[PDB]
Ligand binder design. Structure first.
Ligand SMILES: O=C(O)C1=C[C@@H](O)[C@@H](OS(=O)(=O)O)[C@H](O[C@H]2[C@H](O)[C@@H](NS(=O)(=O)O)[C@@H](O)O[C@@H]2COS(=O)(=O)O)O1
Ligand SMILES: O=C(O)C1=C[C@@H](O)[C@@H](OS(=O)(=O)O)[C@H](O[C@H]2[C@H](O)[C@@H](NS(=O)(=O)O)[C@@H](O)O[C@@H]2COS(=O)(=O)O)O1
Ligand SMILES: [Ca+2]
Length: 364
């Protein structure tokens, strides 16, 4: 009933498919993604950081709104993305550039907030973990995410090739994509033999059988900071395959994979760079992470590792050098780069409630 200390921020931008409208942008630099329940993300006027409102993220137990990897598994999301495009990013261009970017899901590739392939960048942000946070949460609170372009496809005959935007736009007319997998696009039909339309007159389609096409979509985040199994962990992922293979689920478990011993497949590596028992992670105070990433350089279609990456992390609240300039494989073999998000990404088929605050982001 006191609604003065917290301000719901409920606008959500589909950053891959839609430009952010000015009145959806937060503090001139963020848009929000994930569930839009009023408590999911709020500006917090009580817990100030550097004398300014911080951001309170909350997922209650019922707040998983996304399908997880396995049938019957779900996941939850309330995050800020530092990467999005606005209408100004398409200013003066032919109308079809934006329209085709929505269909190819490459809208945010036209916007600010990404770091290119093989680049080096410094990041800083702060987190505030309440003492009430359950030690068995399974949540990623900051991540650096790839930006694959789904115009890189595999044909039914197994050829990996780059479609032009126009070619992809044509393919999407006949193909219903379920994540990365193409299916025959089938019109649902009424009884007079006509295509069904929703209440707004929009034609409705469903997926038929797989049609052989695959597109580059999804993939693990190259870097994630989170809690799992009673540990705070930092996990780095690398994928050197030109077209990522979604079936190759090379993914280290902080509870099972020893620290700094990469788990590898033929193309992927997943490394737990740091672990700290949950009780040793400070509570009810602001912790500032300083992160330096030298992104791995990959050889594109050659699939080589041209140059290894490196990861450095400091944790201040005292300064602990928790990841000390580690040579590491980190990134994705894509044409495009990486963007930062923070918030709640509740994974591992968990519904344990999550709530904490974040603030103070910068990158250089
Ligand atoms: O770590 C994640 O946030 C995450 C990994 C992504 O690879 C993707 O996984 S997936 O299960 O959906 O395949 C989901 O990431 C993107 C997702 O790729 C994207 N789909 S797209 O628009 O068709 O390209 C969309 O669903 O957004 C999610 C998260 O991105 S966002 O939080 O910046 O919006 O989850
Ligand atoms: O081992 C996995 O591949 C894996 C474990 C699952 O528990 C799943 O979490 S769940 O809540 O969806 O069930 C999970 O998380 C991945 C997710 O699959 C991936 N999407 S994809 O690459 O496009 O398929 C992406 O969003 O990253 C998350 C982070 O994985 S994590 O669980 O290791 O944190 O995948
Ligand atoms: Ca790729």
């Amino acid at each position: 009933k006191n609604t003065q200390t917290l301000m719901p921020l409920t606008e959500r931008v589909n950053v891959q498919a839609d430009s952010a409208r000015i009145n959806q942008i937060i503090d001139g630099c963020w848009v929000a993604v994930g569930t839009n329940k009023p408590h999911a993300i709020q500006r917090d006027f009580t817990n100030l950081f550097d004398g300014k409102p911080s951001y309170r993220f909350e997922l209650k137990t019922e707040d998983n709104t996304l399908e997880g990897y396995a049938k019957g598994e779900t996941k939850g999301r309330a995050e800020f993305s530092y990467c999005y495009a606005t209408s100004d990013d398409f200013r003066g261009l032919p109308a079809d550039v934006y329209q085709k970017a929505q269909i190819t899901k490459t809208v945010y590739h036209h916007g600010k907030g990404a770091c290119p392939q093989g680049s080096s960048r410094d990041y800083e942000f702060s987190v505030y973990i309440p003492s009430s946070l359950d030690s068995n949460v399974s949540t990623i609170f900051a991540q650096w995410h790839g930006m694959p372009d789904r115009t890189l496809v595999q044909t039914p005959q197994g050829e990996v090739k780059k479609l032009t935007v126009d070619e992809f736009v044509e393919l999407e007319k006949t193909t219903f994509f379920k994540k990365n997998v193409g299916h025959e696009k089938v019109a649902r039909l009424d009884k007079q033999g006509n295509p069904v339309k929703d209440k707004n007159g929009k034609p409705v389609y469903k997926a038929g059988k797989p049609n052989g096409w695959l597109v580059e979509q999804g993939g693990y985040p190259p870097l994630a900071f989170g809690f799992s199994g009673g540990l705070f962990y930092i996990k780095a992922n690398s994928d050197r395959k030109w077209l990522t293979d979604k079936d190759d689920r090379c993914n280290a478990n902080p509870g099972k994979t020893p620290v700094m011993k990469p788990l590898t497949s033929e193309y992927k590596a997943s490394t737990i760079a740091y672990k700290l028992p949950f009780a040793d992670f400070p509570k009810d105070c602001w912790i500032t992470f300083r992160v330096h990433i030298d992104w791995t350089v990959y050889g594109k279609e050659a699939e080589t590792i041209v140059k290894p990456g490196m990861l450095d992390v400091r944790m201040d609240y005292v300064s602990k050098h928790i990841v000390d300039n580690e040579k590491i494989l980190i990134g994705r073999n894509d044409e495009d780069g990486y963007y930062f998000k923070f918030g709640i990404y509740r994974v591992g088929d968990s519904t344990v409630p999550v709530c904490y605050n974040l603030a103070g982001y910068s990158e250089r």
